[PDB]
Amino acid sequence: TAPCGFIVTDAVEPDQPIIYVNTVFEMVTGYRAEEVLGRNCRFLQCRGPFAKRRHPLVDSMVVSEIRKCIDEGIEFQGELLNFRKDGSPLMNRLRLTPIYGDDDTITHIIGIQFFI
């Protein structure tokens, strides 16, 4: 199976909703595709589906760089704490890469998750 989680967001809709996750994402995070479709990926920074705030131990500096990289259309790589649906911790080595469309808009961002 894939060595990594794969995520595709729609870069044209507001706030990068997920339109696809692969089976490694589902297996490792314990969320199912149907639960996460249309949501922003940031719920992974909250400890389980009932925590309403980002966890203190997710590095706000990395989050902030992710936001910037997305805003500016440029690739990203870094590591931040995430959580499985059962609230258990995940170290997510994350790479984001924009997909440019026919001309010359970003249509998609791809996320690649190496859990380490």
Added chain:
Amino acid sequence: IPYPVGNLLHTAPCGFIVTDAVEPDQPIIYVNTVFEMVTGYRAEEVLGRNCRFLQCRGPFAKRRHPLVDSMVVSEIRKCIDEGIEFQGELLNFRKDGSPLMNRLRLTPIYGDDDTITHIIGIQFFIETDIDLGP
């Protein structure tokens, strides 16, 4: 009663490929189901090989087809070697010989410390007018 993974797999919008950037000549270590379905090549046929077989017209042609854009192929080579990103359209072929326009994105993965361990390819297959006739 568990809930299965992969329920919306049929909606995957692109091919995904992973190569081992450490081993020689970027051999493929994973392809997803979109890749298989669109190219007609099934994972067992492609693992261990370089992705360039897709530039040959089907599995019994040993060399890249002359209508594949050799300039673009060169840039791909350069971006991989320089450890940088690539996005471009490239003519490929299904196993059945039919033409494929492959909007390919390559992105390197840096590992623990602190070198490229993988490359991810993302394929958005799009339409062409290219048609090699009956």
